[PDB]
Amino acid sequence: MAKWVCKICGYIYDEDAGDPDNGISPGTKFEELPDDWVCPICGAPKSEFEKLED
Numbered sequence: 001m002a003k004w005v006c007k008i009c010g011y012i013y014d015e016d017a018g019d020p021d022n023g024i025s026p027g028t029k030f031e032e033l034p035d036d037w038v039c040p041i042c043g044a045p046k047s048e049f050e051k052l053e054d
């Protein structure tokens with residue numbers, strides 16, 4: 001699945017990993033993260049992530 005970078009801190013949201021510590025099962029696409037999900041490292045909103053693809 002895809003990977004997304006937090007433009008602020010460099011955390012990688014890896015769709016294959018999800019974010020289970022913060023309520024997100026492995027396999028959850030970035031689009032499906034709740035609107036108020038934030039970077040677990042720096043707190044940046046979803047707007048600050050960039051999909052790692054051309």
Ligand SMILES: [Fe+3]
Pocket residue numbers: 006007008009010011039040041042043044
């Ligand atoms: Fe971040």
